[PDB]
Write a protein that binds this ligand. Structure first.
Ligand SMILES: OC[C@H]1OC[C@H](O)[C@@H](O)[C@@H]1O
Ligand SMILES: OC[C@H]1OC[C@H](O)[C@@H](O)[C@@H]1O
Ligand SMILES: OC[C@H]1OC[C@H](O)[C@@H](O)[C@@H]1O
Ligand SMILES: OC[C@H]1OC[C@H](O)[C@@H](O)[C@@H]1O
Ligand SMILES: [Ca+2]
Length: 297
């Protein structure tokens, strides 16, 4: 029943931030070092790209039209019709060598995204240089906490009272109390401790049953976690090791899309993993996900 299929063979260097746009039946994502925001029309099977001038680490839908994205250390807005990209807000202005990493829109339309020191190789970087931010609908930015190694996967409970969060080099999935009307968070705690063979926790999405799916970078898998118990429910393996993120999409959010990377693989690794950097689809998981929220500014 569970089927893993490589569905887009474009060999991205580090595919990240998959988000399903049901209005266009398209998958949006980024290829970070390639400095492109990608939109894959799954019907026509055509990919369109917007080139940007710095590494781009996440993309989200913008409610009023178009898209938003994290490029370098700037929150940016994109009009797809004119390919125009402009800055909404900047962060980490006191940092020499930082960039945004993962980001996602909360259930009130705020664009959460966190930063990291820039890497020279995978997970080789200055420690604790990142912070978590959110871009509010009025374009102001809230700073939540600092000392982040690599800001990564994040999502919100279905009752909108819990915020789930991954700093990759903590090797844990954490939770906070979260207030929907204000976007405030409180009382960080560990919810899941990654096993050795699960490697580095990367991207994460919630499903319609309130369980969490986490992409395991270097672990060649996604895992399903119960945040209520702190236990793993399921593991699904993929034929690429550097699985970076996941989201639900397609008909009624019943299909999972998984991004991955070829950056960091040596000659032998590339040969063992011919689909490194491609987009995968997983069907038959037996759960559906939920629609992404759109940025409200
Ligand atoms: O550290 C290697 C990779 O780990 C996963 C991060 O999301 C990505 O930005 C980073 O480049
Ligand atoms: O001051 C009370 C208010 O504090 C903020 C909460 O989001 C709101 O629901 C509550 O009513
Ligand atoms: O959302 C389900 C659970 O997720 C983990 C949180 O630490 C816990 O407080 C919450 O009840
Ligand atoms: O309520 C503000 C915003 O919250 C996110 C929703 O996806 C968007 O439609 C809404 O406009
Ligand atoms: Ca990531």
């Amino acid at each position: 029943s569970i089927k893993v299929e490589c569905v887009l063979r474009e060999n991205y260097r580090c595919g990240e931030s998959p988000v399903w746009e049901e209005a266009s039946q398209s998958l949006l994502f980024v290829d970070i070092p390639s400095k492109i925001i990608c939109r894959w029309d799954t019907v026509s099977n055509q990919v369109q790209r917007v080139a940007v001038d710095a590494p781009v680490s996440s993309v989200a839908l913008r409610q009023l039209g178009g898209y938003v994205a994290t490029i370098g250390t700037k929150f940016c807005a994109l009009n797809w019709e004119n390919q125009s990209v402009f800055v909404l807000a900047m962060v980490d202005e006191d940092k020499k060598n930082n960039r945004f990493n993962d980001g996602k829109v909360d259930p009130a339309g705020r664009y959460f995204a966190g930063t990291m020191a820039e890497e020279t190789a995978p997970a080789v970087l200055e420690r604790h240089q990142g912070s978590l931010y959110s871009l509010f609908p009025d374009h102001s930015v809230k700073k939540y906490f600092d000392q982040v190694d690599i800001s990564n996967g994040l999502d919100w409970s279905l009752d909108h009272k819990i915020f789930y969060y991954i700093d990759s080099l903590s090797y844990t999935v954490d939770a906070f109390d979260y207030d929907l009307q204000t976007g405030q968070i409180s009382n960080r705690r560990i919810v899941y401790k990654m096993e050795k063979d699960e490697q580095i926790p990367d991207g994460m999405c919630i499903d319609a049953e309130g369980k969490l799916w986490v992409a395991c970078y270097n672990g060649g898998r996604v895992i399903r976690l119960d945040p209520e118990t702190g236990k793993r429910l399921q593991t699904v393996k993929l034929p690429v090791d550097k699985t970076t993120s996941c989201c639900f999409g397609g008909k009624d959010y019943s299909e999972m899309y998984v991004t991955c990377a070829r950056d960091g693989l040596n000659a032998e690794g590339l040969l063992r993993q011919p689909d490194a950097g491609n987009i995968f689809k997983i069907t038959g998981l037996g759960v559906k996900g939920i629609a992404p929220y759109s940025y409200a500014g």
